[PDB]
C-alpha cells in the first residue's frame, strides 16, 4: 500500500508463435532478507491466461484473490464468454489507476500473459497505472538486465519458437540470478498455449564460476 | 406518526388506551415517609415453576434511586435500562455530585424520552421512583405519557383506586418514621389475594443512607407480626 515490507523481485515473459512463457523466481524479499523461498508469484487467471507480479507479495495475494473471485463469478454464469487476457490487462490497469488516484497504490508491477483467439497477448501494468503490451516484458531490474537480450533477439527474429523461447527465458533468469541481489536460484516458468496454462515448478538454473579463478 | 401520536379533538386516545393497559394488576404501592421512601410490590408468579430470585420488580437505577413499575414488564425493562444510562450520563457530565435526589427530579424530567418520544407505540408502564440524596426523600411517578407527579403515597395496580383510598385513610401522614413499610405492606394486603410471603412480595427502601432492595429475610421479618 504505502510502504511494502515483503517485496517480490523481478518477473519476465516473452510471447512466441502460438503461446507465451513467463518466469518468476520464488523469493519473497523482506528488504535485503530472503525470508520466503518457496512462494509462487505466478497465478493462473483462468485456463488460458497467466499473471505474475513483482513487489509487495501481500498486495499480490490480494490481487490474486480478487481476480480469481471475479473469474469464478464470470464462469459461474455459464454464458460461454470469458475474460480475455486483453480484458484482464485492461481491468488490472484500471484497478492500479484507481488505487493511485485514491493515493493508496498497489506496490506491484504485473505481467499478464495470454493466448486467446489463436493470437498471443502479453500485457504489462505497473503501480503507477502505466500499461502497454510488447512481445517481451520484464519488471524491476529484469527490465534492465534480461530485457536487452530479449530486445536484441526479437529485432532479428520478430517471431519465436517455444523451445528456443524458453531457453532464452532460462538464460535471462541465469543472468538475473548472476547480477541481481534480490534474485534466487529457484524460479517457476509458466507457459500459456492453446492447450492451456502449464506451470513447470521449482526450476533452477546452473551457475558458472570459472571466472572465479580469474581473480588472480 | 413515529412519535407519541393519535390525538383527536381534545383527546389522546392512544395514551388513554396505554393507561388502560397500565391499569395492569401489580399493585406496587409507594410511600414517602419522613426518613425515606418505600416502594413495595406484589410478585405473584403463575405456579411454583417460575422463580422469584431470578427476575425482580424493584430495580436500583443508581446508588440511592430505586424504581418500581406497573404492567408491561418487557417495556419496563427497557425503560429502566434507559433510566440507568441517563442517570449515569448525568453523573459523568456533572462529575461526582453523588447525584440521587438532586438527581431524582432531574431523572424524572429526563424521563421524556420515556414518552414524549413514544416510539410509534407508547410505553405501557407507569413507574415510581425514590431518592434521598438531598437530606429529604422524594417519590415521583412517571406515567406512560405524563410527567413527574411528585407523590407522597400512591398505588398503580388493578385496585389502585381503593389502594390510594386505603393510603389516605390510614393517613400516609407526615410524621411517619421510615417504618411506614408496615403500612405499605398493609396497602398491598388490600390489593393482594393470598397469604403473601417473602418471595411473593418485593420491596425496596430508599433512605438518606442510600437505596436497598430488601432481601426475603427482612421482607419475611416484616410480614411476620402483621
Amino acid at each position: 500500500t504505502q510502504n511494502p515490507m515483503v517485496t517480490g523481485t523481478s518477473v519476465l515473459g516473452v510471447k512466441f508463435e502460438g503461446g507465451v512463457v513467463i518466469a518468476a523466481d520464488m523469493l519473497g524479499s523482506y528488504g535485503s532478507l530472503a525470508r520466503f523461498r518457496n512462494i509462487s508469484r505466478i497465478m493462473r487467471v483462468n485456463n488460458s491466461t497467466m499473471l505474475g507480479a513483482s513487489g509487495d507479495y501481500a498486495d499480490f495475494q490480494y490481487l490474486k484473490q480478487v481476480l480469481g473471485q471475479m473469474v469464478i463469478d464470470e464462469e459461474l454464469l455459464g454464458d460461454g464468454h470469458s475474460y480475455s487476457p486483453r480484458a484482464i490487462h485492461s481491468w488490472l490497469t484500471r484497478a492500479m489507476y484507481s488505487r493511485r488516484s485514491k493515493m493508496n497504490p498497489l506496490w506491484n508491477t504485473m505481467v499478464i500473459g495470454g493466448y486467446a483467439d489463436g493470437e498471443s497477448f502479453l500485457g504489462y501494468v505497473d503501480m503507477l497505472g502505466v500499461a502497454y503490451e510488447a512481445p517481451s516484458l520484464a519488471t524491476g531490474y529484469g527490465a534492465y538486465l534480461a530485457q536487452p537480450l530479449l530486445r536484441e533477439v526479437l529485432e532479428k527474429q520478430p517471431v519465436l519458437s517455444q523451445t528456443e523461447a524458453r531457453d532464452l527465458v532460462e538464460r535471462c533468469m541465469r543472468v538475473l540470478y548472476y547480477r541481481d541481489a534480490r534474485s534466487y536460484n529457484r524460479f517457476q516458468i509458466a507457459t500459456v498455449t492453446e492447450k492451456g496454462v502449464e506451470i513447470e515448478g521449482p526450476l533452477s538454473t546452473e551457475t558458472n564460476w570459472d571466472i572465479a579463478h580469474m581473480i588472480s | 406518526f413515529s412519535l407519541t401520536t393519535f390525538s383527536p379533538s381534545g383527546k389522546l386516545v392512544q395514551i388513554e388506551y396505554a393507561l388502560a393497559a397500565v391499569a395492569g394488576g401489580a399493585p406496587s404501592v409507594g410511600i414517602k415517609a419522613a426518613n425515606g421512601v418505600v416502594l413495595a410490590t406484589e410478585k405473584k408468579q403463575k405456579s411454583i415453576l417460575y422463580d422469584e430470585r431470578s427476575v425482580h420488580k424493584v430495580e436500583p437505577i443508581t446508588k440511592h434511586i430505586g424504581l418500581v413499575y406497573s404492567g408491561m414488564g418487557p417495556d419496563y425493562r427497557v425503560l429502566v435500562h434507559r433510566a440507568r444510562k441517563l442517570a449515569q450520563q448525568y453523573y459523568l457530565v456533572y462529575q461526582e455530585p453523588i447525584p440521587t435526589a438532586q438527581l431524582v427530579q432531574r431523572v424524572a424530567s429526563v424521563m421524556q424520552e420515556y414518552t414524549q418520544s413514544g416510539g410509534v407505540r407508547p410505553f405501557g408502564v407507569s413507574l415510581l421512583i425514590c431518592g434521598w440524596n438531598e437530606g429529604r426523600p422524594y417519590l415521583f411517578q412517571s406515567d406512560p405519557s405524563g410527567a413527574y407527579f411528585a407523590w407522597k403515597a400512591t398505588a398503580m395496580g388493578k385496585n389502585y383506586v381503593n389502594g390510594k383510598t386505603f393510603l389516605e385513610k390510614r393517613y400516609n401522614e407526615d410524621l411517619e418514621l421510615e417504618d411506614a413499610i408496615h403500612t405499605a405492606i398493609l396497602t398491598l394486603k388490600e390489593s393482594f389475594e393470598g397469604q403473601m410471603t417473602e418471595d411473593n412480595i418485593e420491596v425496596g427502601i430508599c433512605n438518606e443512607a442510600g437505596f436497598r432492595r430488601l432481601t426475603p429475610t427482612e421482607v419475611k421479618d416484616y410480614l411476620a407480626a402483621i
Binding site: - | 388506551y17 393497559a21 405456579s47 417495556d75 427497557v78 410509534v120 407505540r121
Partner: protein
C-alpha cells in the same frame, strides 16, 4: 380500527399482536420441556420427522449458543433460526466486549430486549418463536430461562413450551411440588416421562433430541442415540 392488525394498544387496554404471536409458537406442532435439577439442567423436545428423505442429522431444534449455553426453539423454524443466530452473535459479542463468558440470564435478557424492541414500533413484527435456553452458571448451579415473543424473560426449574405446554407444566408442577431433588438421572427421567405422558408414543429413542448441561461436565451435550436409549431403558425398568 387496525387495533388487531398492527402493534398498537387495544382500546380495551391490551396488546393483541403479541397475544397472537404467542399462539404462533403453538402453531407448528411441537413441544419442548426443560427441567432444572440439583446440579444439572436437561431439556428435551420431540423430533417430528415426516418421511425419511429428510436428514435427521440436521432437523434439530436445539443448538449451542456458546460453549456452555444450549437453547431449544419452539415455533416457526425460520424465526427460530434467526433468533438462534442473534443469540450466538450476542454471546460472541459479549465474550469480545467483556472477558468472561456471558451468563445465561444476561443472554436471555438481551434476547428479550431484542424481542421487546420488535414488539415496539410498527415497521417490523415479532418473531414467532419462544426460546428455552439453559446453562451452568457458577455460584448459581444450573440455570434455565425462557424468552418469549413479548420480551418477558423468566422461567425456572421446570418450564415447557409448545402446543401441549400446559399439560407438561401441570405435570412438572406436580413433580416439583413433590419435594425431592433430581440427580443427573432423575432429572432426565422426569423430563422424559413428562414429555411421554404429554404425547404417549412411548418415545422410541429416535423421536426426541435431548440436551444436557451438568455442573461437573459443562458444555451443551446433545445426547446421542445411545445415551437417550440408555436413559429410556433405565426409565422403563
Amino acid at each position: 380500527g387496525f387495533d388487531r392488525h398492527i402493534t398498537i394498544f387495544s382500546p380495551e387496554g391490551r396488546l393483541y399482536q403479541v397475544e397472537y404471536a404467542f399462539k404462533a409458537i403453538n402453531q407448528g406442532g411441537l413441544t419442548s420441556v426443560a427441567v432444572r435439577g440439583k446440579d444439572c439442567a436437561v431439556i428435551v423436545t420431540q423430533k417430528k420427522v415426516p418421511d425419511k428423505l429428510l436428514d435427521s442429522s440436521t432437523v434439530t431444534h436445539l443448538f449451542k449458543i456458546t460453549e456452555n449455553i444450549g437453547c431449544v426453539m419452539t415455533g416457526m423454524t425460520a424465526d427460530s433460526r434467526s433468533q438462534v443466530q442473534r443469540a450466538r452473535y450476542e454471546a460472541a459479542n459479549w465474550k469480545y466486549k467483556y472477558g468472561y463468558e456471558i451468563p445465561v440470564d444476561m443472554l436471555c435478557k438481551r434476547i428479550a430486549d431484542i424481542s421487546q424492541v420488535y414488539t415496539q414500533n410498527a415497521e417490523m413484527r415479532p418473531l414467532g418463536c419462544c426460546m428455552i435456553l439453559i446453562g451452568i452458571d457458577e455460584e448459581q448451579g444450573p440455570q434455565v430461562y425462557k424468552c418469549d415473543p413479548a420480551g418477558y424473560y423468566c422461567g425456572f426449574k421446570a418450564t415447557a413450551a409448545g402446543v401441549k405446554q400446559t399439560e407438561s407444566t401441570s405435570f412438572l408442577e406436580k413433580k416439583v411440588k413433590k419435594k425431592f431433588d433430581w440427580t443427573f438421572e432423575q432429572t432426565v427421567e422426569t423430563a422424559i416421562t413428562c414429555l411421554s405422558t404429554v404425547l404417549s408414543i412411548d418415545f422410541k429413542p429416535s423421536e426426541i433430541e435431548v440436551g444436557v448441561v451438568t455442573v461437573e461436565n459443562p458444555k451443551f451435550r446433545i445426547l446421542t442415540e445411545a445415551e437417550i436409549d440408555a436413559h429410556l431403558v433405565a426409565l422403563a425398568e
